Design a protein around this ligand. Structure first.
Ligand SMILES: NC(=O)c1cccn1Cc1ccccc1Cl
Length: 133
């Protein structure tokens, strides 16, 4: 029942500072423009200890499955090949991606009826808000 309040189908309804976050990550112009338009659906499910997060959008469809605390390889939507570890910290899913000596952290939390996604690269944060679909 670890992540019960995350499970479901979620739709992106607002984004702030995502272009600057993607710049800080190293995403190139064309991908930033097209990826910034997307309004993904995020589908979260749990089966035993395995959590699956799917993102479906006009830009890219992605899917990760993982066990908390157990590192896995991830190819991100912008085509980075990263090593990811996701933990639960005080009810927040904390997702750290490592690649090429760099690191970014994505935090996912429930706030009211929203799922709030905070993406941090160095000093730059983007906040992406999802609602139930
Ligand atoms: N994986 C990440 O660090 C991340 C955080 C928020 C979105 N993403 C993937 C992403 C999707 C489209 C374009 C650029 C990127 Cl960085």
């Amino acid at each position: 029942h670890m992540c019960d309040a995350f499970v479901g189908t979620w739709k992106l309804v607002s984004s702030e500072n995502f272009d600057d976050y993607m710049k800080e990550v190293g995403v190139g112009f064309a991908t930033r423009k097209v990826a910034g338009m997307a309004k993904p659906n995020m589908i979260i499910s749990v089966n035993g200890d395995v959590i699956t997060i799917k993102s479906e959008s006009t830009f890219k469809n992605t899917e990760i499955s993982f066990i908390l605390g157990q590192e896995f390889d991830e190819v991100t939507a912008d085509d980075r090949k990263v090593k990811s570890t996701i933990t639960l910290d005080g009810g927040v899913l904390v997702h750290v991606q490592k690649w090429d000596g760099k690191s970014t952290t994505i935090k996912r939390k429930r706030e009211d009826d929203k799922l709030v996604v905070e993406c941090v690269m160095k000093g730059v944060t983007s906040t992406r808000v999802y609602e139930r679909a």
